[PDB]
Design a protein around this motif. Structure first.
Motif, PDB file in Angstrom:
ATOM      1  N   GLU A 191      -4.293  26.779  19.042  1.00  0.00           N
ATOM      2  CA  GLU A 191      -5.675  27.220  19.053  1.00  0.00           C
ATOM      3  C   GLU A 191      -6.004  28.324  18.058  1.00  0.00           C
ATOM      4  O   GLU A 191      -6.406  28.044  16.928  1.00  0.00           O
ATOM      5  CB  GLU A 191      -5.971  27.696  20.465  1.00  0.00           C
ATOM      6  CG  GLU A 191      -5.913  26.610  21.476  1.00  0.00           C
ATOM      7  CD  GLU A 191      -6.212  27.139  22.834  1.00  0.00           C
ATOM      8  OE1 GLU A 191      -6.084  28.362  23.016  1.00  0.00           O
ATOM      9  OE2 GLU A 191      -6.643  26.358  23.698  1.00  0.00           O
ATOM     10  N   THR A 226       0.830  -1.204   0.000  1.00  0.00           N
ATOM     11  CA  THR A 226       0.000   0.000   0.000  1.00  0.00           C
ATOM     12  C   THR A 226       0.868   1.260   0.000  1.00  0.00           C
ATOM     13  O   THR A 226       0.959   2.009   0.969  1.00  0.00           O
ATOM     14  CB  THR A 226      -0.967  -0.009   1.185  1.00  0.00           C
ATOM     15  OG1 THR A 226      -0.224   0.044   2.406  1.00  0.00           O
ATOM     16  CG2 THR A 226      -1.752  -1.283   1.165  1.00  0.00           C
ATOM     17  N   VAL A 227       1.511   1.461  -1.141  1.00  0.00           N
ATOM     18  CA  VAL A 227       2.395   2.600  -1.326  1.00  0.00           C
ATOM     19  C   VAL A 227       1.599   3.866  -1.628  1.00  0.00           C
ATOM     20  O   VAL A 227       1.947   4.953  -1.156  1.00  0.00           O
ATOM     21  CB  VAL A 227       3.401   2.245  -2.435  1.00  0.00           C
ATOM     22  CG1 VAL A 227       4.241   3.426  -2.805  1.00  0.00           C
ATOM     23  CG2 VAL A 227       4.277   1.091  -1.975  1.00  0.00           C
ATOM     24  N   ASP A 228       0.556   3.745  -2.454  1.00  0.00           N
ATOM     25  CA  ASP A 228      -0.461   4.751  -2.783  1.00  0.00           C
ATOM     26  C   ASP A 228       0.067   6.179  -2.869  1.00  0.00           C
ATOM     27  O   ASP A 228      -0.246   7.018  -2.023  1.00  0.00           O
ATOM     28  CB  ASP A 228      -1.692   4.673  -1.849  1.00  0.00           C
ATOM     29  CG  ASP A 228      -1.423   5.041  -0.401  1.00  0.00           C
ATOM     30  OD1 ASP A 228      -0.272   5.153   0.033  1.00  0.00           O
ATOM     31  OD2 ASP A 228      -2.420   5.268   0.309  1.00  0.00           O
ATOM     32  N   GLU A 229       0.852   6.463  -3.898  1.00  0.00           N
ATOM     33  CA  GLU A 229       1.346   7.813  -4.105  1.00  0.00           C
ATOM     34  C   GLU A 229       0.201   8.815  -4.165  1.00  0.00           C
ATOM     35  O   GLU A 229      -0.904   8.489  -4.604  1.00  0.00           O
ATOM     36  CB  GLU A 229       2.156   7.887  -5.396  1.00  0.00           C
ATOM     37  CG  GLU A 229       3.522   7.235  -5.348  1.00  0.00           C
ATOM     38  CD  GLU A 229       4.478   7.957  -4.421  1.00  0.00           C
ATOM     39  OE1 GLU A 229       4.432   9.201  -4.384  1.00  0.00           O
ATOM     40  OE2 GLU A 229       5.281   7.284  -3.742  1.00  0.00           O
ATOM     41  N   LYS A 230       0.473  10.026  -3.677  1.00  0.00           N
ATOM     42  CA  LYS A 230      -0.350  11.205  -3.922  1.00  0.00           C
ATOM     43  C   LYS A 230       0.426  12.451  -3.505  1.00  0.00           C
ATOM     44  O   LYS A 230       1.533  12.369  -2.963  1.00  0.00           O
ATOM     45  CB  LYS A 230      -1.687  11.150  -3.184  1.00  0.00           C
ATOM     46  CG  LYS A 230      -1.601  11.047  -1.686  1.00  0.00           C
ATOM     47  CD  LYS A 230      -2.995  11.230  -1.164  1.00  0.00           C
ATOM     48  CE  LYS A 230      -3.909  10.184  -1.760  1.00  0.00           C
ATOM     49  NZ  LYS A 230      -5.340  10.405  -1.430  1.00  0.00           N
ATOM     50  N   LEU A 231      -0.181  13.612  -3.759  1.00  0.00           N
ATOM     51  CA  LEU A 231       0.393  14.914  -3.425  1.00  0.00           C
ATOM     52  C   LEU A 231      -0.688  15.772  -2.771  1.00  0.00           C
ATOM     53  O   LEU A 231      -1.660  16.165  -3.422  1.00  0.00           O
ATOM     54  CB  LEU A 231       0.940  15.598  -4.671  1.00  0.00           C
ATOM     55  CG  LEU A 231       2.019  14.850  -5.449  1.00  0.00           C
ATOM     56  CD1 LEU A 231       2.397  15.631  -6.699  1.00  0.00           C
ATOM     57  CD2 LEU A 231       3.233  14.590  -4.579  1.00  0.00           C
ATOM     58  N   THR A 288      -0.050  19.935   5.790  1.00  0.00           N
ATOM     59  CA  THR A 288      -0.418  20.873   6.836  1.00  0.00           C
ATOM     60  C   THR A 288      -1.045  20.088   7.976  1.00  0.00           C
ATOM     61  O   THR A 288      -1.441  18.936   7.796  1.00  0.00           O
ATOM     62  CB  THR A 288      -1.398  21.946   6.352  1.00  0.00           C
ATOM     63  OG1 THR A 288      -2.551  21.311   5.799  1.00  0.00           O
ATOM     64  CG2 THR A 288      -0.771  22.875   5.320  1.00  0.00           C
ATOM     65  N   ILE A 289      -1.130  20.706   9.146  1.00  0.00           N
ATOM     66  CA  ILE A 289      -1.624  20.053  10.348  1.00  0.00           C
ATOM     67  C   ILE A 289      -2.465  21.052  11.122  1.00  0.00           C
ATOM     68  O   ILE A 289      -2.184  22.255  11.123  1.00  0.00           O
ATOM     69  CB  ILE A 289      -0.462  19.521  11.204  1.00  0.00           C
ATOM     70  CG1 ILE A 289       0.324  18.486  10.425  1.00  0.00           C
ATOM     71  CG2 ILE A 289      -0.972  18.890  12.449  1.00  0.00           C
ATOM     72  CD1 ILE A 289       1.604  18.138  11.067  1.00  0.00           C
ATOM     73  N   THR A 290      -3.510  20.559  11.776  1.00  0.00           N
ATOM     74  CA  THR A 290      -4.518  21.479  12.267  1.00  0.00           C
ATOM     75  C   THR A 290      -5.152  20.993  13.561  1.00  0.00           C
ATOM     76  O   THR A 290      -5.438  19.806  13.735  1.00  0.00           O
ATOM     77  CB  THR A 290      -5.590  21.699  11.197  1.00  0.00           C
ATOM     78  OG1 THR A 290      -6.555  22.640  11.670  1.00  0.00           O
ATOM     79  CG2 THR A 290      -6.272  20.399  10.833  1.00  0.00           C
ATOM     80  N   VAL A 341      -4.115  21.468  16.935  1.00  0.00           N
ATOM     81  CA  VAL A 341      -3.337  21.253  18.161  1.00  0.00           C
ATOM     82  C   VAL A 341      -3.123  22.554  18.941  1.00  0.00           C
ATOM     83  O   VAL A 341      -3.513  22.631  20.115  1.00  0.00           O
ATOM     84  CB  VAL A 341      -2.021  20.528  17.822  1.00  0.00           C
ATOM     85  CG1 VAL A 341      -1.238  20.271  19.061  1.00  0.00           C
ATOM     86  CG2 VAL A 341      -2.292  19.243  17.076  1.00  0.00           C
TER      87      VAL A 341
END
Ligand SMILES: NC(=O)c1ccc[n+]([C@@H]2O[C@H](COP(=O)([O-])OP(=O)(O)OC[C@H]3O[C@@H](n4cnc5c(N)ncnc54)[C@H](OP(=O)(O)O)[C@@H]3O)[C@@H](O)[C@H]2O)c1
Ligand code: SF4
Ligand code: SF4
Ligand code: SF4
Lengths: 208, 57, 176, 152, 80, 114, 319
Positions: free
Chosen positions: B17, B2-7, B11-13, B15
């Protein structure tokens, strides 16, 4: 040099060169670097793929026992572009040695539990989910240890300002113990200790 | 496997405030305190944020 | 090397097994100690009868703070800002500003007495040898508005006994 | 007329002369509480018998460090105590938190959670400035329940 | 076990929520090429027809319904 | 980006998931509201649940939408049991905290430079 | 001058003073000044230990206590000399066996309307009641409407306040009921006619003050406090039994703090809704709070679990 300077010992440093030479020999699908700490300890830089695999080889063999898991831990480094780090640490009871296994990661990429290999990574993996945020899949249980029920920040990483974001205080206006934003009585002074001149030549960073 | 390339731009959201969008960080090379000539306090690109009010207690 | 504990086997012969059946059924043990080792009460009690008698100490003891002064007084502290900078807990707070003649001294000096963790790091960094942990456990007042100290609480609290302090250091200062 | 103010040489001498302190062990400070009930400095038999259940007490005592997850517990226990209650903190960590005062998961100060009366200052208070801190609280009943009924 | 059982129960429920459908109780309503809401909202409707009348929809069913036709019908062949 | 996803694959099984545990929350708000002996209008308990699930709306990605879940999947452990004592719950609905202005001219008379 | 943010350990530039501030209301105001920052000098009369349950209210070095009597014209002059606003909640129920009660709404609110006016306070405040009318009623309810007349003379700027019958947490208004386990509930006077008044919830009143505490521009201009909708029924006394499912005291017990077979029984049924033209609330707002939802909380009795309460009221009429 002798009187105050720690006397070294060579023999310990010859073998842990050998015995670690060839665990880059027989599992090259995984291990990407190995070295010898000047104090006679080893560090095996391993891709994140092998974790369950490599230990399992270290789990049993007649040339490397490493049955006793001592210390799992972590380090979190910004400007490593893959933040966190793991460090496993294992003692082989017969052969009297320590060999540590370093495996990098990120927050989003999962890592796979070591729990069927050793049953003593049961707690040490519950903890890290609280602190740094690494998420260990296929873990018989995942919960909250060392922390309260409110901390949504995952503290020990490097973005949590030391005092957390909510102080606590009790008020009698009703009957609870409730939480109001943090208001201190002293700044927590920031001193500045880092002195110039680069006293260490040996570690001299690349010239650039 | 399950290599499943994507782009998708990472970003992270959630944590922190409101301090996500309010502020502006800064990336700068420290300047060498000039009262002394030691050149070794340079060489690492740090970052440090904006400064907001400190009042008196 | 080794040792092996709790590795023994019963003898299994009728000279013995009475000795273990004269035990279960007649209680010949279990009255051995606590029929006896308990009494054994006839020893003199050990109590320090408190409001009056008091117990031992040593000249290196730690406790309530002070600021000495030489003979005719200089407020021995020069405000070199050290006993402040080694402090683990960060209790100390110091603000100098040049005194009228031009010799420097302090203005605000505040040891919080809740935060101070009683190191013995602020007794040992002062080069001019001012600030000194006293040997008196006088404490315990009823309001946290209090234990914070100012300067001019300390000096008295350190001039109330200097016959205590000035005679300890001259026992202890020859070691360090 | 004067009988009341002579009556409070009884009831205000009864409540001060028998105390049933709860204790909280949490942190280092608990051991230098034990040695108050060990025979050297002998806590009990100087009028104060040591720990009882939460319901029967008068003076609770806070040792130790109060994290977040312990606050919801304390607040509740302080309530259930009967009327004539007090709170005597001790140790440098119930006064504004020892160190850890800048941490994330420590409440700062334990005055914030309850109406605390007497304080004591230092990692472990020396098992002395404890009792010295009570012979403050047995002298902190000079109060009179006269002059509430009997003035206003 | 009647087609007057499962057409009576269904058609009033969809009216009973305070949200979008204003008497589209016609049995075809096709949901968002039709009337429209947020996908999460369509996932709300499924539940109250189960606690009522008894049922589950454990499965990918609730994704295909799209109309009180199918739900009635998928209930129709389910119970009787 | 090549790394193995956690549970979901793209956005659908994912957005089947967030639909799912909604009900475990939606079906159980109130059994607690009598259990802790906390008093509120039970509909509040169904406003907050729906107030939160609508909050993080702009998420563009799997392994984020799976990350948030692993938090959300937990809480139903504690709350549906009693590991909280009234005061880990009610902290969601902030009773005591004086309002923030959030408008302009109400700031300018109180507080410097936010 | 206000600094920073209003959390705690902040400034916000206002001092205060609050007289009284021990019993039900005053405790519940200061708690809203132990948050937005202040200097709240709370004096108190006789009570050394009854004031402690207050102290974890302001952060540190905010609230500060004094001692005073109030018939001594100095005790009110030693504190207030440094102040900005000073409100006054003082006064109580039944005539004391010591204080003759006649002027304690007259001389006391003036005794503190002494040098306060002189010394340069500002935004001085006082309390009134929605039902006090200088026509003949009611022996306690009277002497209160005298202050609106007698005292208003002094300090032309007041913004003296006029709220309704209030229901708090520990309050004695709606709690006189449900303490009535007794030969039976007997309404006042055995009539279901004129109940009930405008039962506003104690938060909104105590959020009114601090909304006028720097308003600005309300001084001299008095306000009155709207209730919720709308008037109310007899059912309020049934509503009590609908859900309920049927300081400085003493050591042992007191001698008299009764139900007062006197004004008390007739003070509760005096109703007299009064002039709308007072601004009086949303202008000072924004607050209004109902009853049906907020009356479970304050009422918890020997079931302590079951509720299942569906029963409501129209208004009721005259509405
Ligand atoms: N706005 C309303 O809805 C409402 C309803 C009923 C009554 N009131 C009146 O509005 C105010 C609310 O009072 P409350 O709810 O807090 O009940 P309260 O029991 O009257 O509280 C008043 C506190 O101040 C004390 N006190 C009495 N007379 C005093 C005096 N001359 N000087 C100083 N302290 C005095 C009382 O006893 P201590 O002296 O021992 O402290 C009590 O501690 C009172 O004036 C009350 O008569 C208002
Ligand atoms: S005593 Fe030593 S350290 Fe403390 S102030 Fe004076 S000089 Fe600086
Ligand atoms: S006493 Fe211990 S803690 Fe207090 S200042 Fe000196 S060193 Fe720091
Ligand atoms: S110092 Fe802090 S930790 Fe050590 S005992 Fe006193 S309080 Fe507990």
């Amino acid at each position: 040099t002798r009187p105050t300077v720690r006397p070294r010992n060579d023999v310990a440093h010859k073998q842990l060169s050998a015995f670690g030479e060839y665990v880059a020999e027989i599992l090259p699908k995984y291990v990407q670097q190995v070295q010898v700490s000047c104090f006679n300890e080893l560090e095996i830089c391993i891709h994140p793929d092998g974790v369950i695999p490599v230990l399992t080889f270290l789990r049993d063999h007649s040339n490397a026992q490493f049955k006793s898991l001592a210390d799992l831990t972590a380090v979190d480094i910004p400007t490593r572009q893959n933040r966190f780090e793991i460090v496993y640490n294992l003692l082989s009871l017969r052969f009297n040695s320590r060999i540590r296994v370093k495996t990098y990661t990120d927050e989003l990429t999962p890592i796979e539990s070591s729990v069927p290999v050793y049953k003593a990574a049961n707690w040490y993996e519950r903890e890290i989910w609280d602190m740094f945020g690494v998420f260990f899949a296929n873990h018989p249980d995942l919960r909250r240890i060392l922390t309260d029920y409110g901390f949504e920040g995952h503290p020990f990483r490097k973005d949590f300002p030391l005092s957390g974001y909510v102080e606590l205080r009790y008020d009698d206006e009703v009957k609870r113990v409730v939480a109001e934003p943090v208001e201190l009585a002293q700044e927590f002074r920031k001193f500045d200790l880092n002195s110039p001149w680069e006293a260490f030549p040996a570690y001299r960073q690349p010239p650039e | 496997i399950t290599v499943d390339e994507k782009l998708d731009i990472t970003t992270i959201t959630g944590v922190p405030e409101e301090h996500i969008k309010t502020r502006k960080a800064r990336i700068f090379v420290p300047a060498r305190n000039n009262m002394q000539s030691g050149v070794n306090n340079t060489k690492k690109w740090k970052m440090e944020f904006d400064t907001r009010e400190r009042w008196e207690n | 090397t080794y040792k092996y504990v709790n590795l023994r086997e019963p003898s299994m012969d009728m000279k013995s097994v009475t000795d273990r059946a004269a035990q279960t059924l007649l209680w010949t043990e279990l009255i051995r100690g606590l029929g006896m080792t308990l009494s054994y009460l006839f020893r003199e009690p050990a109590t320090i009868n408190y409001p009056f008698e008091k117990g031992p100490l040593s000249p290196r003891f730690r406790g309530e703070h002070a600021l000495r002064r030489y003979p005719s007084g200089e407020e021995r502290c020069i405000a070199c800002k050290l006993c402040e900078a080694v402090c683990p807990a960060q209790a100390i707070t110091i603000e100098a500003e040049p005194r009228a003649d031009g010799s420097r001294r302090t203005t605000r000096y505040d040891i919080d007495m809740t935060k101070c963790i009683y190191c013995g790091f602020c007794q040992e960094a002062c080069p001019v040898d001012a600030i000194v942990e006293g040997p008196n456990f006088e404490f315990s007042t009823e309001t946290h508005e209090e234990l914070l100290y100012n300067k001019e609480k300390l000096l008295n609290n350190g001039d109330k006994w200097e016959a205590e302090i000035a005679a300890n250091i001259q026992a202890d200062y020859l070691y360090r | 007329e004067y009988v009341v103010a002579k009556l409070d040489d009884l009831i205000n001498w009864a409540r001060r002369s028998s105390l049933w302190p709860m204790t909280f062990g949490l942190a280092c400070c608990a051991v230098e509480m034990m040695h108050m009930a060990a025979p050297r400095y002998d806590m009990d038999r100087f009028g104060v018998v040591f720990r009882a259940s939460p319901r029967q007490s008068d003076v609770m005592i806070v040792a130790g460090t109060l994290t977040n997850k312990m606050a919801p517990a304390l607040r509740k226990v302080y309530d259930q105590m009967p009327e004539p209650r007090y709170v005597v903190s001790m140790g440098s960590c119930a006064n504004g938190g020892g160190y850890y005062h800048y941490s994330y998961s420590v409440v700062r100060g334990c005055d914030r959670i309850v109406p605390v009366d007497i304080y004591v200052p230092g990692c472990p208070p020396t098992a002395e400035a404890l009792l010295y801190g009570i012979l403050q609280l047995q002298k902190k009943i000079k109060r009179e329940k006269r002059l509430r009924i009997w003035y206003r | 076990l009647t087609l007057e059982g499962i057409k009576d129960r269904v058609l009033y429920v969809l009216k009973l929520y305070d949200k979008i459908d204003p008497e589209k109780l016609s049995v075809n309503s096709h949901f968002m090429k039709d009337l429209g809401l947020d996908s999460l909202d369509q996932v709300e409707i499924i539940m109250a027809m189960e606690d009522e009348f008894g049922f589950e929809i454990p499965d990918i069913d609730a994704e295909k319904l799209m109309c009180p036709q199918e739900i009635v019908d998928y209930i129709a062949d389910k119970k009787d | 980006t090549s790394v193995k996803p956690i549970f979901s694959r793209d956005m659908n099984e994912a957005k089947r998931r967030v639909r799912e545990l909604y009900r475990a929350w939606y079906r159980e708000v109130p059994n607690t509201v009598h259990l802790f002996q906390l008093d509120i209008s039970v509909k509040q308990g169904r406003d907050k649940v729906r107030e939160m699930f609508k909050k993080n709306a702009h998420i563009t990605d799997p392994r984020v939408v799976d990350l948030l879940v692993i938090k959300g999947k937990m809480e139903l452990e504690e709350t549906i049991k009693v590991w909280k004592q009234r005061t880990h719950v009610m902290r969601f609905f902030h009773e005591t905290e004086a309002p923030r202005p959030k408008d302009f001219l109400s700031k300018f008379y109180v507080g410097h430079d936010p | 001058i206000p600094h920073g943010k209003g959390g705690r350990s902040s400034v916000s530039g206002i001092v205060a003073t609050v007289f009284g501030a021990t019993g039900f209301l005053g405790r519940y105001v200061v708690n809203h000044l132990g948050r937005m920052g202040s200097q709240v000098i709370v004096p108190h009369r006789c009570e050394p230990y009854d004031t402690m349950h207050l102290r974890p209210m302001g952060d540190l070095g905010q609230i500060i206590f004094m001692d005073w009597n109030g018939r001594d014209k100095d005790s009110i002059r030693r504190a207030v000399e440094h102040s900005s606003v000073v409100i006054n909640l003082v006064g109580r129920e039944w005539e004391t066996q010591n204080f003759d009660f006649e002027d304690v709404f007259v001389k006391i609110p003036q005794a503190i309307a002494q040098v306060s006016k002189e010394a340069g306070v500002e935004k001085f405040i006082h309390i009134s009641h929605l039902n006090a009318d200088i026509k003949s009623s009611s022996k306690y309810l009277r002497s209160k409407a005298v202050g609106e007349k007698e005292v208003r003379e002094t300090f032309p700027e007041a913004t003296i306040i006029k709220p309704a019958e209030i229901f708090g947490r520990e309050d004695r208004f709606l709690n006189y009921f449900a303490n009535i386990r007794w030969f039976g509930g007997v309404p006042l006077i055995s009539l279901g006619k004129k109940t009930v008044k405008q039962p506003v919830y104690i938060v909104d009143v105590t959020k009114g003050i601090i909304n006028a505490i720097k308003d600005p521009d309300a001084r001299g201009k008095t306000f009155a406090f709207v209730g919720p909708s709308r008037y109310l029924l007899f059912d309020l006394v049934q509503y009590v039994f609908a859900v309920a499912h049927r300081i400085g005291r003493l050591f042992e017990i007191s001698p008299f703090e009764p139900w007062t077979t006197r004004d008390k029984v007739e003070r509760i049924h005096t109703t007299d809704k009064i002039l709308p033209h007072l601004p009086g609330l949303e202008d000072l707002g924004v607050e209004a709070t109902p009853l049906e939802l907020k009356a479970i909380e304050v009422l918890r009795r020997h079931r302590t679990y079951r509720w299942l309460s569906s029963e409501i009221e129209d208004v009721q009429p005259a509405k």
